[PDB]
Amino acid sequence: ENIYNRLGEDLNKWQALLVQIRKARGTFDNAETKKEFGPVVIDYGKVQS
């Protein structure tokens, strides 16, 4: 409801944030299960689903 009130009657209804949500699906929705960086590996395995 907060989002609806903030963006009530946007370009049409939102038309903007619904666009960046698909981009925010990044760092996510990939066959990659754990992000490696040097010797530090962060495994987003329990939350992936």
Binding site: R22, R25, D29, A31
Partner: peptide, 23 residues
Amino acid sequence: AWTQVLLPKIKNVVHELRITNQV
């Protein structure tokens, strides 16, 4: 011989099924 192998060293070809944006 290659044909009957299909049905000679043959490489194993593999492909996967995944899902993205629920497709």
